[PDB]
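Q: What does the predicted 3D structure of MUC2 Mucin Domain Peptide look like?
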Amino acid sequence: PTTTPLK
Ligand SMILES: *[C@H]1O[C@H](CO)[C@H](O)[C@H](O)[C@H]1NC(C)=O
Ligand SMILES: *[C@H]1O[C@H](CO)[C@H](O)[C@H](O)[C@H]1NC(C)=O
């Protein structure tokens, strides 16, 4: 799994 640009 991955994650979207955390900002
Ligand atoms: C996590 O990042 C990867 C990089 O290709 C994919 O874009 C994936 O779809 C992402 N997962 C989510 C939940 O956005
Ligand atoms: C997505 O979020 C996760 C958890 O915070 C990680 O920081 C990961 O490095 C993030 N992905 C991107 C592409 O920044």
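A (community wiki): The structure tokens above were generated from the sequence. Residues 3, 5-6 surround A2G (ligand 2) (CB under 6 Å). The chain is about 0% helix and 0% strand.
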